[model samples]
Target: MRSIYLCRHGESELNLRGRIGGDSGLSARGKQYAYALANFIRSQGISSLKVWTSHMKRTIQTAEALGVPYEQWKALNEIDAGVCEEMTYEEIQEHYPEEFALRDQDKYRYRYPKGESYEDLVQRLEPVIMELERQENVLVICHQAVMRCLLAYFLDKSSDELPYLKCPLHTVLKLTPVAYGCRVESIYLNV
Candidate 1:
């Protein structure tokens, strides 16, 4: 069966500092993860593979490590954090407690002030999913929220749990379509 190798880009500099929605380069470990991930994929020896990435520095950097040509999908960008863009969780809570609480309460639908909702994300990603549905050996490098949305579609997760799905950095999720549904294998390429 054709498979999808999906994952978040290696951890970014802002990721280590707990910031949200800032386009930045990867961290030291993040760079290491990029090479390690590259090694892992090459080890699989899969021919006829295409690489897809978000239009983000981190994702691009990760793809560079693979030394492979990649295509950027603008729709695969991270969730728009809006007014809270690039803010830490503490900062968001300190300045916009109500908004923070609202997000926690209904993360799937709560739009960031001047930003977007997970609902909107799904709409943007639906087309990408349709493409992945029929593709072969695609390795997708994107962000947490984007990965969450894709995982929800493949794993049959509900909207309620989609936003909070665990999308760890430095890990890859290998998805194979089965007879009834999809099968997932978590590969934590500990570097």
Candidate 2:
């Protein structure tokens, strides 16, 4: 069976600060997760593995722990927060109340002032998805939003459900494509 592995980058410095969308390095715990991830991949006994990651520092750092060369895809970068980049959720609500409220109302279509919407994210991930479908034994280290978009496509999740899909830090989600649908397993490496 062909397996597709998906994971968000280990927690970032900005993530610890409750901020979103910045090119920050991983936190200490995040670094530990990276090492743990490397061990996990080795234990899986999978060969001919292809690793893909976003251009962001966090993702690149996490992928590096695997000790394998990876392809960096700009398309897999985190959702652009645009005007709200690096701001905490509370700050976004306080500073851009209207935009925040609008996002809550229609998350899929709501675009940050200069940022992307879930719809836009889906559009951006088309090429990644296409390549993924045709590949095997691949691991993708990306951001939460991008993972959600990819998971939604393979899991047949609704657009409304896609934005809130639970992709937690340091967890590897393994998806094996079956005849009827995809089978999934979550492996959390306690770092």
Candidate 3:
């Protein structure tokens, strides 16, 4: 069976601060998840497994724990928050209430000013998805929005549900391609 593993980078400093879009390093807990993830992957004994990550430091740092060479894909990077980058949701709501409401009204199509939207992300990820379809036993360490997009694709979810998919931190989503659909499993490393 062909399987793909997907994970968001462990908790980053920005994550702790409740900020969006920043190239922050991993927090202590995030580092712990990295080690736990490494052990789990090593235990799986997937010699042919291909590991992938985003160009961001957080994802790259998480992938390093796997102790295997990985390919970095710029397309796998997180959704750009545009002018809203590095701002917390509260800040966004307070500063740009109309923009925040617009996103809520049409998250899929709503593009952040000077940033990318879910719709834009889907377009950017087309190549990555194509490559993923042609591969086997691949592990992708990326961001929350990116993982949500990939999950929606394989699980046949609607755009409405894609943005809200529950991809928790310190968790690994194992997706196995089957005859009719994909089999999904969640492994949470108790970090």
Candidate 4:
């Protein structure tokens, strides 16, 4: 059977500071997870896995393991935070107060001013989704937002619940295609 592994990038520097989205590099703990991930893959006897990472430093660095050739896909990048790229959630509440409240009210529809909404991400992932349906043994190393979108599609989640799916860092989500629905397993690297 064909399977796909989806893992969020290792904890980034911005992640430590409670920032939503950014292109920051991994933190020290995150780097540890990266190395641990390589060891874990080898232990699992997973060979010849194709890796796809976002263009961001964190995602690319995380996929440097498995010692396999990988590709960077701009389409796999995280949702653009735009004006709030590096700002923390608290900061957003303070600065873009109204926007933040609006998001809380309708997260799926709320687009960060000059940025993206959950709906926007869903649309952007259309091509990736189409290709994914035809691929096998692919590993996607991407962001929380992007992963949620993909997961929602394959798992048949509702739009209202898609935006808040829990995509923890340093974890691998293994998806198995089955007769009725997909089987998903999460492996935490404890990073």
**Best lDDT among the predictions, by candidate number:** 2
TM-scores, in order shown? 0.98, 0.98, 0.98, 0.95
User: Against the hidden true structure, what lDDT does model 1 obtain?
Assistant: 0.92
CA lDDT scores, all candidates in order: 0.92, 0.94, 0.93, 0.86
The C-alpha stretches of model 4 lying farther than 4 A from their native spots are none
Q: 11-41 in candidate 2: lDDT tens per residue?
A: 9999999999989999999999999999999
Sorted on TM-score, best first, the list reads: 2, 3, 1, 4
lDDT of each residue in 10-102, candidate 4, tens digit only: 899999989888789999998888888888777766646678888999988988855777898888899988798889888998999988888
Candidate 4, after superposition: displacement of residue 13 in Å?
A: 0.8
Candidate 3 wrongly placed segments (more than 4 Å): none
Candidate 3 local distance difference test against the native: 0.93
Per-structure clash totals for the candidates: 0, 0, 0, 0
Give me the runs in candidate 2 sitting further than 4 Å from their true place: none
Give me the runs in candidate 1 sitting further than 4 Å from their true place: none
Model 2, residue 16: what's the lDDT?
95
